[PDB]
């Protein structure tokens, strides 16, 4: 039985699974980006974008013209 060892930082990365969790809480209004970021261990700049993406821009996305980099 059991297995695991997490808590109080200790390693600093999230699975693509964990990310969906920390989005669903925020979407459902359980918290906001800043709050869940810290709870789930997600970067704010990721979580922010990912909420603002999963909100449903992903269907019929904007791809017609661009010319940029970062």
Curated annotation (Swiss-Prot):
Chain segments carrying region Disordered: 58-70
Tissues expressing the protein: Ubiquitous.
Location in or out of the cell: Nucleus
DNA-binding region positions on the chain: 33-53
Highest taxon of source: Eukaryota
Occurrences of domain HTH psq-type (ranges): 8-57
Assembly description: Interacts with ESR1 and ESR2 in the presence of estradiol. Interacts with CTBP1, HDAC3 and HDAC6. Component of a large corepressor complex that contains about 20 proteins, including CTBP1, CTBP2, HDAC1 and HDAC2.
Purpose: May act as transcription activator that binds DNA elements with the sequence 5'-CCCTATCGATCGATCTCTACCT-3'. Repressor of ligand-dependent transcription activation by target nuclear receptors. Repressor of ligand-dependent transcription activation by ESR1, ESR2, NR3C1, PGR, RARA, RARB, RARG, RXRA and VDR.
Name assigned to this protein: Ligand-dependent corepressor
Organism: Homo sapiens (Human)
Gene name of the record: LCOR
Range covered out of full length: 343 to 405 of 433
């Amino acid at each position: 039985g059991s297995s695991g060892s997490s808590g109080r930082g200790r390693y600093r990365q999230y699975n693509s699974e964990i990310l969906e969790e920390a989005i669903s809480v925020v979407m459902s209004g359980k918290m906001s980006v800043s709050k869940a970021q810290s709870i789930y261990g997600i970067p704010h700049s990721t979580l922010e974008y990912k909420v603002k993406e999963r909100l449903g821009t992903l269907k019929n996305p904007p791809k017609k013209k661009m010319k940029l980099m970062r």
